[PDB]
């Protein structure tokens, strides 16, 4: 049906707008950018004026 085809096109448009694999990739890239490592030292005197 033409209505079914139009609904399928609209749903495909919504799904393309909602991939989110790039969102997960952005999160992983943010984690890689952070890449911290700490706590080998505990008592760290943060002497600040």
């Amino acid at each position: 049906h033409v209505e079914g085809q139009k609904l399928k096109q609209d749903g495909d448009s919504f799904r393309m707008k909602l991939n989110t694999q790039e969102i997960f990739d952005d999160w992983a890239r943010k984690v890689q950018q952070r890449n911290l490592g700490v706590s080998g030292r505990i008592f760290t005197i943060e002497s600040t004026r």
Binding site: R41, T44, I45, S47
Partner: peptide, 28 residues
């Protein structure tokens, strides 16, 4: 009677503690 003479009981100052701690951090 040997009055008092109780070693002048007092602790290191918190600023003095900060100084010694900064010294330790420099040693760290």
């Amino acid at each position: 009677r040997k009055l008092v003479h109780d070693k002048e009981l007092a602790a290191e100052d918190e600023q003095v503690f900060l100084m010694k701690q900064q010294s330790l951090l420099a040693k760290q």
